[PDB]
Amino acid sequence: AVSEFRPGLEGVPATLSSISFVDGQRGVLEYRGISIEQLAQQSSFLETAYLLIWGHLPTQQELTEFEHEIRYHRRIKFRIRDMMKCFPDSGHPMDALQASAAALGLFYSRRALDDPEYIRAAVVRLLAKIPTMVAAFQLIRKGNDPIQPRDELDYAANFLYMLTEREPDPVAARIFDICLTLHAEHTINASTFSAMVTASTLTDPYAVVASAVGTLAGPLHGGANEEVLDMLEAIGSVENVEPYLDHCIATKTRIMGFGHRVYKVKDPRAVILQNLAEQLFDIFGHDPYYEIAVAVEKAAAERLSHKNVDFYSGLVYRKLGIPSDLFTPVFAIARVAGWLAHWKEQLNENRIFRPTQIYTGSHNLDYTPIADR
Amino acid sequence: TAVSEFRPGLEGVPATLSSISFVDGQRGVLEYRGISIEQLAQQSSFLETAYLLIWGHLPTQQELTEFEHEIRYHRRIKFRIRDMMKCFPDSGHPMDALQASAAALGLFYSRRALDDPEYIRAAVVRLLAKIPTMVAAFQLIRKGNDPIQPRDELDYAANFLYMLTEREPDPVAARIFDICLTLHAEHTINASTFSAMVTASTLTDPYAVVASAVGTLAGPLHGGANEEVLDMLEAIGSVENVEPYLDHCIATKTMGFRVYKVKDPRAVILQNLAEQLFDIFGHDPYYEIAVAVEKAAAERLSYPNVDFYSGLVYRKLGIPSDLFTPVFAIARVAGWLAHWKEQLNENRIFRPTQIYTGSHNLDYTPIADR
Amino acid sequence: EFEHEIRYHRRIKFRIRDMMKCFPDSGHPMDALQASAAALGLFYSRRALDDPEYIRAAVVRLLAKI
Amino acid sequence: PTMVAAFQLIRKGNDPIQPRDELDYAANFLYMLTEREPDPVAARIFDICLTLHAEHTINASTFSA
Ligand SMILES: [Mg+2]
Ligand SMILES: [Mg+2]
Ligand SMILES: [Mg+2]
Ligand SMILES: [Mg+2]
């Protein structure tokens, strides 16, 4: 119970960082000092990733070259596909991603360290291939051949095309990218911290993404996006939205929907997502569940007056046709940009992260020959 | 308000309250659940030490026998896991392969999401039993050789050596390997253990936690050791060159691989183990070179003498240099599994804060402007 | 003689097992048996009832391998 | 020629590059190794190089054949 000890390293700074700023008291989230809202209105995930990773907005020549490098590296090796084919059909998709990222290491890990070329090659490879790999498990698990990357399509569209084999409406592709930019970086989140610890050892970059995938996968930091859709299924009609919440008002000690709420209130990402969803639904029509969600928001206002961005995200994904099991994985595709950016920073000044413990245990015990205890 | 303090690397910063391990340093003391490493090494199996760390009580015979039986049944690995390893590149780094293999193990298992105590025991048995088998498989598969099947008669250390070399180990060597495995099992909040704690705090599958930890141990700064030590011994090339070689390094260009200002208790046990193995199974030119380096080093050092020996013992046992970090993983899985259970009881998520050196309130700049 | 013949033919060829490995994990077992039985035909389909032996061989192989 | 290029891709884990009908013999081989169509003058130089090594009278390799 020492004052020095804080459970969960809460309020304890782990690094000095310039990549992102979040205030709980006030809505603001900034990437390299730029408001998320401005970037969302006028940015690409790839441009935002460059800003986060290299700290400067890209020149047109720089951006176009960066996109070209990703397009050439989008495809994945046959050996990687065969391994996924070896994967269990009912295997969890996030566990599959961790294995897939590590495997990429067996090939591209041979590395030049202290070489600037190395940081960019890994960033281009990881950003380009993690989306291709996620789509391939979805197709392979069903016995379906993986849909190859199409050079003509942009990063957001290719991911959607690889999952469905149907080119996305251009407007739909834009919303997905904005969603990707929204989930790219959120300060010292648990997934980023794991990546930073893996990085501290000076391990290869592909391993750091793999360690982060494992942490994102777990439910508390893990996407809880799937839960919102299931509850929405639980209320069959817009009618009964009011009844369902009240029975839930008695509750079994549970928090979801960004319940951890490191921001105390109003994550701004959520506000942008809700607008994005409404625009998408109006163009592409309104699903019955979506109306149920809108109703849930109206009930929330009585809850809102005193004191679910993930909840908004899942709905958007479904309209775009993303499978729910792939939702935590889509977050991984965006967070790779944040993860890579933290990796470069840890490298510039690196001390291995070795913490200390408070011992609550015994001392000076003597070994006992087995005797019944 | 008040001065704000930042320790780089969370150094000296407590992250958890644990009964699993104590290292004094200075006094040179390592204790697992209150028992000296020296006593455990002399009188305990890696598996017995593993029960003590994971469950916190030294086990009873009916418990040790059951635990050993459960490990033997789960020692074998699925064809799908072996086929996936065949897909792996031959030249691929062995530690990256361990990370992928453990993560894959989750796909078959992990269909529990269970608060059942059975779920924790099930993972402990599978992870401890399978990780040694998988490491052996990559070494054989990389050379195009079929993986050697586990032998029920053989114990855990012997089975690993048999799978790696295809030849039954001498009993004395197997005991030395088990003691080495017991020695590297737990060392408080290592970077690898901390990664396991942070992965486990999210409530992710245990197999994933091991995978994230294996990536952390893989890095050269922590858990990457050896190979370089032998690398140097091959380089000196003679007892005669040792006095000159050490001086050249001391004079300029720095030695490879300190946790504490006192000698690691583990190095003390390892050197005696090394001496016994070399005398019993034959000294090698490399061993003699090592002996010379240590005597020479002590007069200049009087020393990073810690855990260099492990490579020497492993080489004598015939473990390849590439697999040395992986051998450590087999032993430290027990500590990682133990921490996973302890983290689970309170399970606060790890969300540390940051100090912002960055700009604020900037505005997007159009690309055409540049 | 019958029991011994059944014991000898109990083992199944690697190519069929590889075929089962190609089969979906969630696939229904009875549908899987139908594919497996039909496959045994590709390896073993030869001869005529005129051979009394052919009837005996099928009886032993099918009883042993199914 | 297709086989030699195919090993080069397989060894590095890359899928083999299939022959393109439009390309001539020298160009397909270069395309198969690189995946980029060769400049024509270079394709001509490679074709001449192949002609130079095609026959050298009775030599260990021909004698074995
Ligand atoms: Mg973009
Ligand atoms: Mg923060
Ligand atoms: Mg700009
Ligand atoms: Mg000739």
Residue numbers in the entry:
A (entry chain F): 3 to 309, 314 to 379
B (entry chain D): 2 to 255, 258 to 260, 263 to 307, 312 to 379
C (entry chain C): 67 to 132
D (entry chain B): 133 to 197
Quote the authors verbatim:
Bacterial citrate synthase (CS) proteins are homo-oligomeric enzymes that can assemble into dimers and hexamers. CS catalyses the condensation of acetyl-CoA and oxaloacetate to citrate as the first step in the tricarboxylic acid cycle. Using cryo-electron microscopy, we reveal how the fractal assembles from a hexameric building block.
To understand why 18mers are less active, we solved a crystal structure of a citrate-bound hexamer at 2.7 Å. Comparing this structure to the one of a free hexamer (Δ2–6 SeCS) revealed that the CS dimers within the hexamer undergo an anticlockwise rotation after binding to citrate. It takes place following substrate binding and pushes CS from an open conformation (which corresponds to the conformation in the Δ2–6 SeCS structure) into a closed form in which catalysis takes place. The rotation into the closed form is in the opposite direction to the clockwise rotation that dimers undergo to associate into the fractal.
